[model samples]
Target chain A: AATVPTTVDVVLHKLLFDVPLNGVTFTVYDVTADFWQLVSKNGGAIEVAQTTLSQDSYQPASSSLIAQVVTAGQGEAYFGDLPLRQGQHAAVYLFKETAAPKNIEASQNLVVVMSSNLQHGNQSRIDLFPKN
Target chain B: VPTTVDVVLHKLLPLNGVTFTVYDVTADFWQLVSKNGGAIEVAQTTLSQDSYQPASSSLIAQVVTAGQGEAYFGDLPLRQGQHAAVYLFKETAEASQNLVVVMSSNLQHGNQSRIDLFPKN
Candidate 1:
C-alpha cells in the first residue's frame, strides 16, 4: 500500500475593491506570532490589530500572501502571487487610494487566511511547494 | 584551495531612451528607420532584439530588466526602487512644474543574444 499526502486550500477573496481605481500596488510579508502582537498594540499606517488563519480538514499545509493593485484608467496595474511559508501566520493592511493622479495609495485591509492546498492557478506556486 | 572566475561588463546607457517611446496614435517609425525592421513595444517585449543582456565585470550572473516611469512634481513623483522594476533614467523630457510627466521607458534592443558568464563587479 502507498502512503497518502494531505492537501489543504485557503483564499482571501473579499478583497474585491468597491470603487474603481486608477492604479494599485500589493506588498507581501512573512510574520511571526510576535509580529501579530506588535501590530495589535501599535495602531499606525500599514499596521493591523489581529489576523485569522483558515485550516482545512484535508490538506495539512498552510500559506498566505499579500497583494497590491493599481489600475491605469487603463494603462498599468499590479496583481498576482504571494510566497508564504507553511503553518506561518501573517497580516495584510490596505490603504485607500492616494490623492495624486498617477500615484498609488493603500485603501483598507483586505486580509484573510488559508492553508497550502489552494486550487487557484497562481504565479508563485513554488512558494507553497513542500519543503524537503 | 579555491579559484575565482573571470567576468566581463557591457553598459548601454547611451541607448537609454532617445530612440524609443510608448508608440502613440501617430506613425513615428516609418519616419525614423530607413530599414523595414520589426517595431518592438512592451506588448511585444521578449528576449533578444526586444530584450537586453548585459555582462558584468566580476559577478557570476547576467540579468537585464525593462523599466518604465511617469512622474509628476513634488506632489507624488515616481522615484527609484519602489518595488517596481522601473528606475529613473536620465532626465530628458520636459516637465511643467507638476502638471504631468511621462518620463522614462527602457528596454534593450539589437540581436537577441544570451549566455552564462562571470560578471565584472
Candidate 2:
C-alpha cells in the first residue's frame, strides 16, 4: 500500500556510539527498478556487487534523480514521499553522503536501504543509519 | 561534469601509481538493501589489508587512474557500481591519512560541479 496524502520518506542518519552525526547532505537515487530486476529474478536475496549486473556502472536518468536533503540536527532528513514499492514490491534507495559533520571524516560508500512496510498510523517512515 | 574528483599530484605522487582499493564488508547487495539506513557500516578492524585479501568479497575494485592533476582539474571515475560507491584510498608506497571518497549521481544533480584539490607533501 502507498501513503495517503502521498507522503513517504527515506531518512538517512550517521551515528557514533549513541550520538547522531548531523549537518551532512545526501545524494539520493531511486535504484528500485534497476535493483528489483536483478534481485527479484535472483529470488529476493543476492548481492549485486557479486553478480554480473554489478559489473555495469549505474547512472540514474536525470529525471529519476531525487531530492537533496541537508541532514538536520536530528541526524536525519526526509527525501519526500518516495514511492514505497517498485512494481508491487518495496522500493530500494541509494543515499550517498555529500558531506560529513563539521570537520569530521565521511564514509564514501553508497548506502542501500529498502522501504519499510508496516502500518504506522498514517505515516510510513523508514529510518536508516549508515555508520560514519 | 562527466566524472570529477581530481586527486591532484601537482606537488605529490600520482594516485595512478598509487593503488586505491574500494572494499565491501559483504558484496551482498541484498544485505545492503535489506537494511533501512541504506549505507553500509564497515568496521575499522575489517578495513585492514590483513583482514580482506585480494580474493575477498570485501574487495570491490581498485583504481589507479587518478593520473596527473590538470591546470583546472582532472576527473576521477571509479565507475564500478550501479548505485553509489564507497572508496578506500590505499597508499602504495608513500602515504597519508587513509581517505574515503563517496561518489553519488546526486552529486551531479546540484548545479555546481568540480573542485580544485591540492595534494599535500
Candidate 3:
C-alpha cells in the first residue's frame, strides 16, 4: 500500500506589473478579487508604465511600486510580492515621464503568464503537465 | 598639506525594452512582428526596460527578491553588468505597439573602476 503526501505546495508566480502615472501621484492598484489591492504609490512628480509576461505563468496576488522624480534624478523604487493563488490576471498602468507638469499617460490589459499546483489529499503527485 | 582623496561617482543609465509578439505556431506564441492587416509573426520576445540601483549603495548585482522571481528593470533584461539603452525597431504590432520591444545593451561593471581609471583617453 502506498502512503500519501500531506502537504500542499503552492507556487508564487511572477508579478504582473502595472504602473499608472498621471499629474497626481503615480499609483498602482490590483484590480482583481484577489487579496491584493492598492499596494503602492509613486511620488507626485514622476512617471512609470510597465508590465510582465512572466505574470501569465503564475498568479496575480500582489503588486509593487515605483516613484517618478521631478528633479534631475530624485525618486524611489520599491517592490512588494502579493500572495497569489492558482490563477491569472491582466496588468494595467499609467506613466508620466515628461518634462513639464502635465504629460500623463495610461495603459491597460497587459497579458502575463502564471502556473500553479493544487493538491488537497492523497493525490498521486498530480502533475500540472499533461502526458501524451 | 592634506592628502587628496578623490571620490567620483558614475551614473548608471537606463536601457531600452523590446518585446515582439507574433504567432507562436503552437498556442501561446506572441511574436515581435504582428499586425491587424498583414499579420507578421516571430518566436523571439524581448523587453529592454530595466535599470539597477544599489539596494544600499553596496548591494549585490542581479538581486533576486526574497520571495519572488528574478527582479529586472522596467521590462526585464539585465546581465551581470549591463544597462538598457532605448527602443529601436519593432514591426506589425497591434494596439499602439503595446506588446513592443525596446533595445538593451551592456553597461559599466559594478566593480570595474573606482573613478580615476575611467575615460582611458
lDDT of each: 0.24, 0.47, 0.22
Model 1 spans > 4 angstroms off? A1-19, A24-69, A73-77, A86-106, A116-132, B1-121
Give the candidate number with the greatest lDDT: 2
Cα displacement (angstroms), candidate 2, residue B71, comes to 62
| Weakest 10 consecutive residues of candidate 3 chain B by summed lDDT | B112-121
Give the per-residue Cα lDDT of candidate 1 at B97.
Answer: 16
Per-candidate TM-score, chain A: 0.31, 0.65, 0.21
* Model 2 TM: 0.40
What is the TM-score of each predicted model, taking all chains together? Answer: 0.23, 0.40, 0.17
Off by over 4 Å in 3: A1-23, A34-86, A89-132, B1-121
In model 1, the fraction of reference contacts reproduced equals: 0.00
Local accuracy of candidate 3 as per-residue lDDT tens digits, A41-132: 43321112123321333343345332232221112211122212223432232222223244333222232112133221221111111011
Task: Say which prediction, candidate 1 or candidate 2, comes out ahead on lDDT.
Answer: 2
Task: For each candidate, report its DockQ versus the true two-chain complex.
Answer: 0.01, 0.01, 0.01
On a 0 to 1 DockQ scale, where is model 1?
Answer: 0.01
Docking class of 2: incorrect
